[PDB]
Write an enzyme that holds these catalytic residues in place. Structure first.
Site, PDB file in Angstrom:
ATOM      1  N   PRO C   1     125.722  19.644  20.552  1.00 42.14           N
ATOM      2  CA  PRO C   1     127.211  19.000  20.634  1.00 42.14           C
ATOM      3  C   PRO C   1     127.424  17.667  20.515  1.00 42.14           C
ATOM      4  O   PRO C   1     126.154  17.104  20.580  1.00 42.14           O
ATOM      5  CB  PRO C   1     127.651  19.487  22.107  1.00 42.14           C
ATOM      6  CG  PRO C   1     126.790  20.488  22.773  1.00 42.14           C
ATOM      7  CD  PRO C   1     125.521  20.487  21.948  1.00 42.14           C
ATOM      8  N   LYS C  32     124.426  23.005  27.487  1.00 44.61           N
ATOM      9  CA  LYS C  32     123.581  22.719  26.297  1.00 44.61           C
ATOM     10  C   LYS C  32     122.382  21.814  27.137  1.00 44.61           C
ATOM     11  O   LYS C  32     122.788  21.099  27.536  1.00 44.61           O
ATOM     12  CB  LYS C  32     124.124  22.713  25.035  1.00 44.61           C
ATOM     13  CG  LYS C  32     125.181  23.504  24.681  1.00 44.61           C
ATOM     14  CD  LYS C  32     124.697  24.124  23.311  1.00 44.61           C
ATOM     15  CE  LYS C  32     125.917  25.399  23.000  1.00 44.61           C
ATOM     16  NZ  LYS C  32     125.395  26.719  23.448  1.00 44.61           N
ATOM     17  N   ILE C  64     128.882  24.222  18.717  1.00 44.15           N
ATOM     18  CA  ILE C  64     128.868  25.407  18.214  1.00 44.15           C
ATOM     19  C   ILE C  64     129.091  26.374  19.206  1.00 44.15           C
ATOM     20  O   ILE C  64     128.079  26.630  20.537  1.00 44.15           O
ATOM     21  CB  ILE C  64     127.299  25.623  17.526  1.00 44.15           C
ATOM     22  CG1 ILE C  64     127.162  24.742  16.361  1.00 44.15           C
ATOM     23  CG2 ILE C  64     127.253  27.074  17.269  1.00 44.15           C
ATOM     24  CD1 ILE C  64     125.734  24.625  16.067  1.00 44.15           C
ATOM     25  N   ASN C  97     140.161  15.659  19.974  1.00 44.96           N
ATOM     26  CA  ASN C  97     139.998  16.931  19.210  1.00 44.96           C
ATOM     27  C   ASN C  97     138.808  17.468  19.265  1.00 44.96           C
ATOM     28  O   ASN C  97     137.670  17.113  19.535  1.00 44.96           O
ATOM     29  CB  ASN C  97     140.060  16.385  17.762  1.00 44.96           C
ATOM     30  CG  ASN C  97     141.437  15.818  17.571  1.00 44.96           C
ATOM     31  OD1 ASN C  97     141.347  14.755  16.713  1.00 44.96           O
ATOM     32  ND2 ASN C  97     142.626  16.293  17.953  1.00 44.96           N
TER      33      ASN C  97
END
Lengths: 114, 114, 114
Positions: C1, C32, C64, C97
């Protein structure tokens, strides 16, 4: 909505009041209240467009809706107009990426807009 | 196409001619005319990768088409190669986000590409 | 990330250890390992939010997977909490975002994650 402009034009060439102007014109163009418009101007960048270091801009407009074919044409006319008049950047040395964000994918105020 | 690289490598470590090199190699890799390639290099950034402040890069490549699994592997090999050779950034400390833009969502020259 | 925060708060107001704190908390939130988390803080920016220049932040989180309605609410709670405590930015002057990236659209280590 959020509008970002990255440019190699120097900071001193950004006129006083440019952020307020962008805020007002984007409020009008998107139909959203100005309170929801965020603007970010990034001058003095190391950039090239077509291999050339003449004035250029790489930009983005994110909005939850109000993004589409005709609307993006209109935004592009507005925003290239403003960048040409205020920053003296040629419209053919501007890219604007448009993003139609899903409300669930925009965080604000410790939650999302969904 | 538009390629941005953000890095903690200092500006003095970015070799002269790097934006032109990127422009040329991206033209060749994407098959796009170089006149449409824009590049933006952002050194001296406050960043970490895996918690570490050793040299790293966070990048993006936007293109109208020419984005896909095999093509992005090829871009990543090219671009990591360039960042390693020119900026001495290890390839495993680079992320590149790839975006296939719809022509209607890219503004240029006071209109869009749709 | 990968997490980016752009802010008008000055560099001297970013506390020591902030990038590490972001890295740790995002590892915990996304599940993660911290080795895969990248963070980028951009202070001293020329920005306005809602027509004014009090402290604000424009941010992005790319991952992801691990992106969705409830997860993004949780991320926004965490991240706005951190930006308020550490940078004194009001949560209602933060946009984040969120991007769910396909593995084939993220380059790393001269290839992609596909």
């Amino acid at each position: 909505p959020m509008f970002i402009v990255n440019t190699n034009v120097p900071r001193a060439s950004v006129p006083d009041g440019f952020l307020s102007e962008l805020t007002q014109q984007l409020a009008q163009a998107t139909g959203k209240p100005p309170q929801y418009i965020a603007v970010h101007v990034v001058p003095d960048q190391l950039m090239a467009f077509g291999g050339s270091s003449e004035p250029c801009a790489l930009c983005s407009l994110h909005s939850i809706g109000k993004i589409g074919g005709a609307q993006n044409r209109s935004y592009s006319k507005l925003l290239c107009g403003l960048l040409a008049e205020r920053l003296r950047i040629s419209p053919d040395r501007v890219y604007i990426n448009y993003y139609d964000m899903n409300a669930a994918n925009v965080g604000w105020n410790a939650s999302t807009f969904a």
